[PDB]
Amino acid sequence: KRIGVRLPGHQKRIAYSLLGLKDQV
């Protein structure tokens, strides 16, 4: 399990928090 660099971080929570309200307003 030494491969986790391809996981979500803080930049994803933003792209999902914006498109989630900007699309589901």
Side-chain angles (χ1 to χ4, degrees), residues 2-22:
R2 201 254 215 282
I3 172 134
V5 187
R6 62 186 266 291
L7 267 118
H10 223 75
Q11 256 197 109
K12 275 67 254 272
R13 172 260 135 79
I14 301 166
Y16 219 67
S17 163
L18 258 300
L19 227 98
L21 220 168
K22 290 258 88 149

